Design a protein around this nucleic acid. Sequence first.
DNA 1: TATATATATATATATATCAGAATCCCGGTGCCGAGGCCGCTCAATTGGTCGTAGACAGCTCTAGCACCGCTTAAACGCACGTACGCGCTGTCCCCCGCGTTTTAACCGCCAAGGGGATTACTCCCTAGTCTCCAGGCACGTGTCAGATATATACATCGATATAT
DNA 2: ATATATCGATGTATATATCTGACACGTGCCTGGAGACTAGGGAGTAATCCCCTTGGCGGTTAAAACGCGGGGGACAGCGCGTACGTGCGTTTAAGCGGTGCTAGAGCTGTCTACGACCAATTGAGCGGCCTCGGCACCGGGATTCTGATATATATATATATATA
Lengths: 82, 82, 106, 106, 97, 97, 100, 100
Amino acid sequence: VLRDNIQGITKPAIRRLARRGGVKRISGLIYEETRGVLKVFLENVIRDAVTYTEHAKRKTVTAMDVVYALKRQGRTLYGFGG
Amino acid sequence: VLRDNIQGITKPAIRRLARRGGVKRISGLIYEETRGVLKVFLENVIRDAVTYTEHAKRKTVTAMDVVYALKRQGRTLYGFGG
Amino acid sequence: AKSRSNRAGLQFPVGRIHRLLRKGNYAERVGAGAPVYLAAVMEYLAAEVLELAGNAARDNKKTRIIPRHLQLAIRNDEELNKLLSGVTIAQGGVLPNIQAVLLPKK
Amino acid sequence: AKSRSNRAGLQFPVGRIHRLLRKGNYAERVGAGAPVYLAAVMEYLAAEVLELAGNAARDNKKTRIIPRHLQLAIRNDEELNKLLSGVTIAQGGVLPNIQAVLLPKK
Amino acid sequence: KKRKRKESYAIYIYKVLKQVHPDTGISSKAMSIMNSFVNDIFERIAAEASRLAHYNKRSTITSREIQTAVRLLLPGELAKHAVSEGTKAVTKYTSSK
Amino acid sequence: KKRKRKESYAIYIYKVLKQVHPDTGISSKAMSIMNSFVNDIFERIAAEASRLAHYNKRSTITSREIQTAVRLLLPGELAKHAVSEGTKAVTKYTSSK
Amino acid sequence: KKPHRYRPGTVALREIRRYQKSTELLIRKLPFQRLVREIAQDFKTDLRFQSSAVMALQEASEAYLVGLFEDTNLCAIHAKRVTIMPKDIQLARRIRGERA
Amino acid sequence: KKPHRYRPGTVALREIRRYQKSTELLIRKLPFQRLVREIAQDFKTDLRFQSSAVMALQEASEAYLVGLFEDTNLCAIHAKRVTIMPKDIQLARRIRGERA
DNA sequence: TATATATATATATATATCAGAATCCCGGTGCCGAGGCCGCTCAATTGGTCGTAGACAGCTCTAGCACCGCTTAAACGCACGTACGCGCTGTCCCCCGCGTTTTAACCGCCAAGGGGATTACTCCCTAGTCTCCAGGCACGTGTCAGATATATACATCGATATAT
DNA sequence: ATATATCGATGTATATATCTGACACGTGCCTGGAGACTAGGGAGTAATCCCCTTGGCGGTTAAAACGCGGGGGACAGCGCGTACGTGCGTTTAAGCGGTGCTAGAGCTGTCTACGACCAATTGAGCGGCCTCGGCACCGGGATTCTGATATATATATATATATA
């Protein structure tokens, strides 16, 4: 039982990420597409990590599954575990 | 004993490759940069293929070495050898 | 007597895939059902690509599959294009796809 | 008696790398000079990365390497950026840069 | 006086083609392309199954590793169609033993 | 009663740091990042050496396979610097036997 | 008198110079955790997550979006603009190859 | 009488519709072979090449250049132009990640 | 009365100056994460045995390189015209900066409880070895789909004479 | 004065022979795949526990949401020179076809150095605890920018003045 939580990724959060990316002015329709793109990226990574958790016969998606799911997509994550 | 052979990559051939790419008009400065880009790509692929050649104590470059060099860079080539 | 590819109903060989999994140094031991599962998946992927390539060859009125028919069959399909992303098909081609801006104004 | 790392003049472990090469099933027979060569290459790469990280730490007036210092050290260099292009560093940053168009005109 | 044996999937691809399209042939370059494609699919699934068996501290590539590797690499409808094909082939094997 | 024996390159990275910078410490997360970097370099070079072993119909990983893997993976100045480093380390190994 | 009010563009430059030099998590932790659980319950129901898994997803998502915004900014400056628009994002995702 | 001369743009569209339908290698074989030998003799003197290696290099280079021209054309149409420019090539190679 | 020159005055603009926020930097306190020490434990090291994979040569055979000649198709350069990219201007709208209000994230503490890791037993599943035999591959031959040549119907593109 | 229907012309695809080189098919054989027994070791099943995750409550508080004034950027339009497409004639150079030849690739036999394996042992590495110094936080000063403003500064003009 949940709600629509993609509205929780607020307008200042996308604003701060875009400032870190280094942009000066942001159009008003950036935010909806940024939410859609983030949802697509998470539906890739989370699906691969959940498959990794399925194969181990576990229920806790650990950090290693997320690192391997990111490594399979060519976005290697140094940091957690390794 | 050689010459300058990058001018053999001829402006009609860049034009025909760009027609296959789907380009309507070509600026007059596309050709020099296209020669430079092709030279960089060949200097990567031929270097990796020649390294594959000198590993195997061979003095000829087979098609398989070029396929392995292209597969290492992400441009997987079905066709020749495989 | 009965070969394992004929026993499982497939056409791709089970014994050769078992050997290539064995002395392809992927793991220390290889289970018995793994070559059959892998041969079935490989045969399904091949059968799908030959189905679309035969359709594309019959669309151009040719009764022999050339590399251009395979190129058209892969890039017209959605999941097959997503699977073979960086794959370059030799002596293939590009899809006929011209942008609407470049077309002349009527 | 004498460990192989001390005999080879390195500090990365030779025996552990030999065990990980044997039991990481890369090939059937891992040779003798292979773990020493691999440990030397890995030790050089770590020495280069830690030297640039220490330079970035001294330039920032801190005496303890944080992940931002590693991000600065790797991306301020060019050949390590070519090596580590596809990797992101956790709790790192981006290089401080901004395009000249976005800067206010004077 | 042959030189060497060359192992290839050519006659198997021809059998699959004649069970799919009974009146369509295939060129030699197309056979080489699909030989390369079949070997590339085998290498991808075998490498992912090896990596999956290594990450669980396991030492045998069973059919479950192949199923999970197929569900990882293949996108969309190809994944579920391939695992249904593989499951019925393994079931036919076990029944016909 | 400890949990498990976890294997890591932390002590060796700290020894390399104290040769390079005698007075610079390192945080825990930076050590974990560097451990991941060392293991990623190890898996890259080992996978390429395995590919070179399989590609030539050979069944071993000698020093030449790792030298060629370093030449293929490492770009530019790093490639020949690491090749010279590994060559003098192998020479110092063999001369001390 | 009128308050000391900045021109449009100075505060954006200051925020660029500030957020590029600090390395915090720009997205809040709890809404991202709720988003991850909402997406993850579609595949396997009744899952559990470590804190490090949600942290790894947050670092990866922020890094991917910052790289995408960098390429989107270069697309916008290429079209003689300073304002990033959605068509820059579809151009960047098309050139990168994520638009299947 | 005045000759029947096509408008600037019609012949370009015909060449786009013709070369996208064709299959053959657009670059001439012998100058590309000379280029490959010139580049290859820097790494190792007195090298030999199989014919299939040179045709593999030609097919790979042609496919890479055609893909780069598709991305460059998308960049050019993005900036309200039909003429591709060198800055389109640098933008496409920068977003692709090929800029060393 | 008609023509030509100069200059105080009003006006739109470059520039030094002054006030206001934001940020860096210095110092004091404290606090918590890293370095160092100690015990356990496990895996690297050494010696001897043995199988085997890779190096040396030598033979052969095959395919890659260099050369020559004919042909002819494609590139190169010149000329001309036109459509398009750049640039300036007007405007209109749409983000941005700032202030007030509310609210939901962060932090901390506590309880329950579900599942990940551990240890032991066993069992069944796979490697190894042998040994036979069917399948697949190289080779040679028929044969048939496809490339090329000549002729032709037709889509279509642009210049033009006409209607409202 | 501009949109509309002809019509000359140019490229495209179609029909049909042909001849052809590439593909489908018959044959040996030898190589790897399959059947059977051994033997052993990896992996599943059962109980434990404790570790970590989830759920809930409170609370200050930083931050998001909303609204408003306005300024600057995006978009549309006009103008125009230029840079590129298109066509034509010519000449260069690639494609093709033989021919030698010769250097390098593959097979083969052998034998030699080298890596797998087993057992014992011990020295290095990892977990746990302490203690201490580098980093975090807070407050004040200096600085370093940004924004609005007065000052003077060049420019157009209308009247005074000199000449005819």
